[PDB]
Design a protein around this ligand. Structure first.
Ligand code: FMN
Ligand code: FMN
Lengths: 133, 133
């Protein structure tokens, strides 16, 4: 019954960004992005496919989650980090990124799934709540 | 390159519940659920597959989103509702449900994708913020 087209529709219905990246040395390049990722980042699939997602950090590269992400990937572990990210138009947003390793039928190829949740509203709500409390 | 297994892994990596339901008269019965849905609801895939998701409402059935959901489905429109839902152990949670119609190669069969986001923390954060403001 269920087919690849239906799973594709499921992935494109996600409110969170969903991507797959493939390890290419020190890069992990996008090989799949869903519609939510395009909307969240302001980049179209064609203009960022086969790039490392670190472009979302812009010039804001002094972020502690980077080293933990690299280490988790190297050790084949999942990880989750809240990162400062920037859309194509430069607008800032808080990105709660969840990275999961993938088991494939080709172990020589190493893939990671990324889930991007825009947590900007939640961060601001926590900030006001701390300011009033 | 990309295959159904990888899309399956993507769907199972989602933090939000992702399901597909098929119209069966006045019911729309689950034909696919991901791991997040099982965790969010406390039900395993085998015990709720081919059931209508309205079981998540428990005995709390006087909910305004129901009529709007039925109308959107009947008209082939997407919809989004925040519902009071209940896990298998009875614990309550706020469920922001996004329903999307599906285009299939068999138009006689009518499918809907459901995305379930647990918004309980966000609702409580909005409540405290209104109480202090
Ligand atoms: C699947 C996947 C998705 C990623 N998504 C993002 C993202 O949305 N935003 C971001 O800033 N970094 C993201 N990254 C992390 C960067 O691609 C990169 O791994 C990170 O910045 C650490 O490596 P670096 O220090 O060499 O840049 C993602 C990584 C992977 C593997
Ligand atoms: C794909 C899909 C997912 C749904 N997920 C939920 C859910 O998580 N929680 C819920 O309370 N209702 C959910 N519903 C709605 C119920 O299945 C049902 O359509 C709703 O209660 C309105 O119909 P009724 O008034 O006959 O119950 C979902 C419906 C669809 C089509």
């Amino acid at each position: 019954m269920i087919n690849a087209q239906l799973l594709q529709s499921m992935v494109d219905a996600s409110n969170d960004g969903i991507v797959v990246a493939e390890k290419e040395g020190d890069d992990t390049i996008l090989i799949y992005v869903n519609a939510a990722f395009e909307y969240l980042t302001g980049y179209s699939r064609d203009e960022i496919l086969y790039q490392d997602c670190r472009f979302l950090q812009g010039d804001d590269r002094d972020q502690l989650g980077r080293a933990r992400i690299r280490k988790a990937m190297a050790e084949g572990r999942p990880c989750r980090e809240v990162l400062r990210n920037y859309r194509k138009d430069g607008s800032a947003f808080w990105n709660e990124l969840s990275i999961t390793p993938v088991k494939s039928d080709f172990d020589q190829r190493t893939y990671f799934i990324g889930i991007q949740e825009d947590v900007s509203r939640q961060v601001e709500l926590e900030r006001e709540l701390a300011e009033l409390r």
